[PDB]
Amino acid sequence: MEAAHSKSTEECLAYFGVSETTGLTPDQVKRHLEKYGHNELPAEEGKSLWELVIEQFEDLLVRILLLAACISFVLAWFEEGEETITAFVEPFVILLILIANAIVGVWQERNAENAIEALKEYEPEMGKVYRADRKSVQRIKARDIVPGDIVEVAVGDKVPADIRILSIKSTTLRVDQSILTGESVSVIKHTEPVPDPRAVNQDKKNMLFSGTNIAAGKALGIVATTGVSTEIGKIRDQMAATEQDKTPLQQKLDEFGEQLSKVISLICVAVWLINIGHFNDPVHGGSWIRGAIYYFKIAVALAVAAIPEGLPAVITTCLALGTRRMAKKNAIVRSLPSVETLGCTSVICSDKTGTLTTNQMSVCKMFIIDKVDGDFCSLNEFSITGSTYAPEGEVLKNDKPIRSGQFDGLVELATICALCNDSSLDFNETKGVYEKVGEATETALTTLVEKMNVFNTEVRNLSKVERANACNSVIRQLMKKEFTLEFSRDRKSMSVYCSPAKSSRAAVGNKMFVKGAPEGVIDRCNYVRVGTTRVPMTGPVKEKILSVIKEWGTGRDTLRCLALATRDTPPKREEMVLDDSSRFMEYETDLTFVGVVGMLDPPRKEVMGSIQLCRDAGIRVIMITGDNKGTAIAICRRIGIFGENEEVADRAYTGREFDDLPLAEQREACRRACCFARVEPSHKSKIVEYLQSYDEITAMTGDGVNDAPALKKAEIGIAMGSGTAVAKTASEMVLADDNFSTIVAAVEEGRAIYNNMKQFIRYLISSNVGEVVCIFLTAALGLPEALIPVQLLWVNLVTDGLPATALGFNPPDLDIMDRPPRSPKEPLISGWLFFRYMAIGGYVGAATVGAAAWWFMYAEDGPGVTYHQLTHFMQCTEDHPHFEGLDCEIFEAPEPMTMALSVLVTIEMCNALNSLSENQSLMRMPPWVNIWLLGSICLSMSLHFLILYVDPLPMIFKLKALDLTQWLMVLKISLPVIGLDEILKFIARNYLEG
Numbered sequence: 001m002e003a004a005h006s007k008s009t010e011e012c013l014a015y016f017g018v019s020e021t022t023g024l025t026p027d028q029v030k031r032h033l034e035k036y037g038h039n040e041l042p043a044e045e046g047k048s049l050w051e052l053v054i055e056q057f058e059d060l061l062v063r064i065l066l067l068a069a070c071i072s073f074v075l076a077w078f079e080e081g082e083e084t085i086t087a088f089v090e091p092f093v094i095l096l097i098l099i100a101n102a103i104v105g106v107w108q109e110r111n112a113e114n115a116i117e118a119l120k121e122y123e124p125e126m127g128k129v130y131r132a133d134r135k136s137v138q139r140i141k142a143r144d145i146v147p148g149d150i151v152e153v154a155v156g157d158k159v160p161a162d163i164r165i166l167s168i169k170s171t172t173l174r175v176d177q178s179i180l181t182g183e184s185v186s187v188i189k190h191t192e193p194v195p196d197p198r199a200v201n202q203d204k205k206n207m208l209f210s211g212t213n214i215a216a217g218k219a220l221g222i223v224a225t226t227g228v229s230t231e232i233g234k235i236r237d238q239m240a241a242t243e244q245d246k247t248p249l250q251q252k253l254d255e256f257g258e259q260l261s262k263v264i265s266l267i268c269v270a271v272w273l274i275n276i277g278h279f280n281d282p283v284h285g286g287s288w289i290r291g292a293i294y295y296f297k298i299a300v301a302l303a304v305a306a307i308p309e310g311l312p313a314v315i316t317t318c319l320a321l322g323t324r325r326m327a328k329k330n331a332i333v334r335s336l337p338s339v340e341t342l343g344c345t346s347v348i349c350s351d352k353t354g355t356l357t358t359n360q361m362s363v364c365k366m367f368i369i370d371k372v373d374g375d376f377c378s379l380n381e382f383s384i385t386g387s388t389y390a391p392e393g394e395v396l397k398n399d400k401p402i403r404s405g406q407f408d409g410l411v412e413l414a415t416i417c418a419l420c421n422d423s424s425l426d427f428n429e430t431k432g433v434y435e436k437v438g439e440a441t442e443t444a445l446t447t448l449v450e451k452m453n454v455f456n457t458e459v460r461n462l463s464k465v466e467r468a469n470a471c472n473s474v475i476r477q478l479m480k481k482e483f484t485l486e487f488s489r490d491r492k493s494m495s496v497y498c499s500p501a502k503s504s505r506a507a508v509g510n511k512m513f514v515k516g517a518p519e520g521v522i523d524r525c526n527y528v529r530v531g532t533t534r535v536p537m538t539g540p541v542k543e544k545i546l547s548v549i550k551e552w553g554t555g556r557d558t559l560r561c562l563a564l565a566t567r568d569t570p571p572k573r574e575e576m577v578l579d580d581s582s583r584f585m586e587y588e589t590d591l592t593f594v595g596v597v598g599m600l601d602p603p604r605k606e607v608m609g610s611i612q613l614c615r616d617a618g619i620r621v622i623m624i625t626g627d628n629k630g631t632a633i634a635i636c637r638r639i640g641i642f643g644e645n646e647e648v649a650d651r652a653y654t655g656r657e658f659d660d661l662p663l664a665e666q667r668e669a670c671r672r673a674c675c676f677a678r679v680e681p682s683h684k685s686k687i688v689e690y691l692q693s694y695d696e697i698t699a700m701t702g703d704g705v706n707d708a709p710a711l712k713k714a715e716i717g718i719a720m721g722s723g724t725a726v727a728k729t730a731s732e733m734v735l736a737d738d739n740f741s742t743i744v745a746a747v748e749e750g751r752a753i754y755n756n757m758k759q760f761i762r763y764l765i766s767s768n769v770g771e772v773v774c775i776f777l778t779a780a781l782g783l784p785e786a787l788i789p790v791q792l793l794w795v796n797l798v799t800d801g802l803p804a805t806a807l808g809f810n811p812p813d814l815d816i817m818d819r820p821p822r823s824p825k826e827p828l829i830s831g832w833l834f835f836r837y838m839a840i841g842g843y844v845g846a847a848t849v850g851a852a853a854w855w856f857m858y859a860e861d862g863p864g865v866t867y868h869q870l871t872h873f874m875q876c877t878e879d880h881p882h883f884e885g886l887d888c889e890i891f892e893a894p895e896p897m898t899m900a901l902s903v904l905v906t907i908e909m910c911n912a913l914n915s916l917s918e919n920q921s922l923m924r925m926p927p928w929v930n931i932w933l934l935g936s937i938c939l940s941m942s943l944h945f946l947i948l949y950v951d952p953l954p955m956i957f958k959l960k961a962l963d964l965t966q967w968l969m970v971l972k973i974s975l976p977v978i979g980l981d982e983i984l985k986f987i988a989r990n991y992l993e994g
């Protein structure tokens with residue numbers, strides 16, 4: 001293992017003590033592999049169904065439901081009557097429901113994958129090495145490779161392990177570092193070391209990254225690191241090292257169950273306590289034993305009456321409808337419980353280029369020297385038309401079209417472009433557009449030249465597959481591109497060494513054409529071409545050139561700038577070391593300025609807008625880029641991140657500056673900064689760490705393996721649709737169109753969803769509260785069971801579901817994206833609201849209980865002790881001649897329970913309307929504000945009726961109610977609720993808030 005890419009080539013061969021000629025002797029292997037182990041990323045930990053199922057039974061609510069289903073199952077085996085056979089339908093369903101979870105929770109998980117499981121997709125199976133047990137190449141297995149032994153790589157290989165390169169057999173070595181680094185092109189490699197120990201992957205040019213692919217060539221190397229120590233391994237760790245939290249909804253889950261479990265217990269405490277007399281009045285008579293079976297069968301009744309059985313399924317049902325919904329709007333939510341979190345994103349750190357700007361290069365201005373006298377300068381500035389790389393546009397100065405050949409300065413600037421360019425242009429018939437063959441910034445140049453055909457060369461008598469490069473290729477036949485000095489991140493420029501063909505361009509042997517950042521190339525210029533002549537680059541001449549440079553890249557224009565020059569007297573060919581990039585800055589001096597070229601990477605429309613929405617939304621937007629600060633900034637104001645004129649010094653730091661600042665200011669910077677320029681790897685995460693130190697839900701967006709470590713830890717990681725599998729499987733959402741805006745649009749559904757989601761949740765809960773109250777009373781008073789678990793379930797599952805899940809469509813507020821993103825800590829039911837549902841429930845609890853008992857104490861179709869002596873219904877067959885000479889079996893009558901169970905049903909089909917709104921009266925928001933909710937209610941009612949009329953059913957529950965006698969009685973109980981709410985709902989006006 002060597003963090004050395006900065007070491008000499010022999011220095012490594014030294015460290016490992018290995019023969020670049022022989023390799024590692026089988027001993028070295030046995031010893032190296034035991035200090036280094038195998039080159040491979042650790043396997044996964046997959047739980048068994050056993051383990052899975054067990055989690056499915058680790059919720060307090062699922063358990064409280066399992067203990068209850070036991071007591072029911074246990075009771076349903078204590079009667080000895082032929083009629084009491086439907087005894088196994090209660091403890092049967094409960095299980096069934098609890099079973100349907102485990103079932104779903106497992107398949108739920110079984111289909112989800114690990115972001116890391118996606119990484120191992122980058123590990124090659126075989127490798128190619130050289131060791132002491134053979135002269136010819138040995139082809140082994142990635143993992144059997146050890147830090148040290150000599151490995152060789154070829155054009156068609158995937159790089160196993162991180163290799164410090166020893167020697168390049170090919171004439172050149174190309175690499176696709178795409179997946180785990182900055183920008184991919186055929187990145188070249190060289191053998192000489194890299195001085196800086198703290199070098200960024202891209203800058204370690206003598207290296208072979210594990211997983212990356214060698215595009216072209218065949219070179220030899222010595223393995224630096226193996227395994228998890230390998231550059232990517234270094235990542236896999238990050239990801240595995242991170243743990244993410246439960247959506248502030250799931251958070252609230254445990255919370256509610258924790259309590260819903262405390263309460264419950266307490267009841268049984270109050271309950272057992274109201275029947276304490278049974279300790280100082282019993283005559284040891286025997287009817288005892290049948291009194292314990294009461295508490296036991298009333299306790300499991302208490303459970304299916306405290307837990308919102310059906311809720312779980314209504315929520316996810318609400319979410320999946322929304323997934324598909326956003327999917328239409330190009331947004332892809334990976335895992336849904338995350339929609340909530342998206343709904344309250346505090347900040348969005350998105351990259352610029354790919355998403356914000358369209359990334360469509362096009363030269364808009366050029367500028368070449370026109371004349372220099374004493375101190376008087378004179379430039380020739382231009383304008384170029386054409387968004388597309390498409391070779392279609394016109395060159396104009398002072399808005400007047402202009403032939404290009406008419407000016408020398410241009411004819412050179414033009415060639416330079418065409419020659420110091422590795423890109424080109426290609427046209428396709430499948431879509432009919434002109435596509436970016438190489439790198440955009442280059443493919444745009446190639447384009448520029450096309451538009452200003454310096455040679456007035458007929459191109460309209462040529463097809464469109466030929467128009468693509470007619471003007472370039474011509475300038476290409478005007479020089480012999482001997483070789484090229486690739487771009488390097490320190491001289492921030494590149495150059496092409498050329499020769500002319502024997503007769504035409506003989507004038508001056510070889511010359512050199514360079515292009516890069518104006519700062520550099522310009523200093524390196526000691527002269528300046530004025531048409532066909534040169535002059536001593538002077539003080540004034542320079543300022544004036546940089547002044548326009550700064551004008552373009554800082555002005556509203558927000559243009560990118562390329563300074564073009566040529567080295568007239570290039571060093572002799574054989575005196576150049578075309579293969580040791582260090583010296584490339586030396587070969588690029590004594591330069592003659594030729595002119596700079598400005599081009600734009602236009603922001604995508606809706607962004608400006610989408611940026612504004614965030615404002616009203618209060619959602620912060622941080623722009624992570626690769627532009628220089630001066631340009632990042634501008635660009636921002638151009639979109640709205642900043643407002644032209646705004647002071648931005650503190651709100652925008654740079655890749656470096658940031659690293660400088662101490663952990664102290666690091667944090668600060670982050671809560672206010674909105675523009676990070678020249679960002680590096682770690683940053684995307686350190687920030688996401690500070691943005692978290694401010695309890696801020698923050699969005700992050702990357703595209704490749706290197707971005708994963710953050711995308712993971714970000715509350716909401718957003719991966720590009722044109723991004724790499726891994727990253728995607730790391731983010732919690734994916735953008736097919738990459739449009740930043742799609743993020744904001746997604747942040748919208750995110751709130752909406754949760755608002756309906758939210759309410760429909762409050763609806764089914766309060767009801768569950770009510771139910772509880774019913775059993776409490778049914779129990780505290782002795783009164784016969786008023787409602788049965790087997791019932792309560794049906795309700796909380798169906799008669800309650802269809803209105804709840806229809807509520808999920810409640811018309812979205814108009815002010816959504818006009819209120820700061822929601823708080824996570826904000827509880828679902830509190831304050832006066834608590835008081836409200838605390839009352840509605842206390843209402844239904846009695847409305848139901850009293851209902852069943854009514855049919856017992858006033859209804860004609862079943863007279864009962866009007867003195868309330870039904871309370872002791874427990875004792876009837878006993879003291880048969882006590883106070884009743886009645887048919888003792890009437891207490892277990894169906895009519896009384898269908899009474900309450902129908903006043904419940906209705907009260908909810910009603911309460912499910914004092915919901916369409918929280919405080920806006922129904923006359924201010926009639927139920928017909930939602931077509932679904934109404935319809936749904938009907939489907940439930942024809943249903944509830946299904947359990948009265950369809951013979952198989954009623955016998956399971958209770959028999960039919962006498963229409964207009966008993967039903968009417970039902971209505972004179974429930975309907976009033978609405979009032980009770982409209983009344984609390986009115987207590988709105990009687991307080992400030994609204």
Ligand SMILES: C/C=C(/C)C(=O)O[C@H]1C(C)=C2[C@H]([C@@H]1OC(=O)CCCCCCC)[C@@](C)(OC(C)=O)C[C@H](OC(=O)CCCCCCCCCCCNC(=O)OC(C)(C)C)[C@@]1(O)[C@H]2OC(=O)[C@@]1(C)O
Nearest residue numbers: 061062252253256259260263309311769772828829834837
């Ligand atoms: C429910 C029924 C009852 C009886 C209950 O105990 O509720 C209390 C309680 C706990 C509360 C409240 C409630 O307090 C009372 O009513 C006092 C008890 C008096 C009644 C007893 C008679 C003597 C709450 C409900 O009501 C009011 C109006 O006071 C409101 C609120 O609740 C919310 O905001 C809910 C949002 C939680 C988040 C929703 C998550 C649950 C949804 C999933 C359902 C899982 N169930 C299930 O069966 O799944 C399977 C797989 C099948 C097992 C919450 O104050 C909560 O405490 C909290 O921490 C909160 C923030 O939570």
Ligand SMILES: Nc1ncnc2c1ncn2[C@@H]1O[C@H](COP(=O)(O)OP(=O)(O)CP(=O)(O)O)[C@@H](O)[C@H]1O
Nearest residue numbers: 353439441442487492493494515516517625626627
């Ligand atoms: N095709 C090209 N050839 C030579 N130099 C180029 C170039 N395109 C840009 N440059 C110059 O080289 C410097 C760096 O190029 P770099 O590869 O970092 O650009 P980039 O801006 O395309 C990254 P990002 O796309 O993430 O914003 C630029 O700041 C510019 O001055």
Ligand SMILES: [Mg+2]
Nearest residue numbers: 183439440441
């Ligand atoms: Mg570039």
Ligand SMILES: [Mg+2]
Nearest residue numbers: 182702703704
């Ligand atoms: Mg990137």
Ligand code: NA
Nearest residue numbers: 244712713714
């Ligand atoms: Na996460």
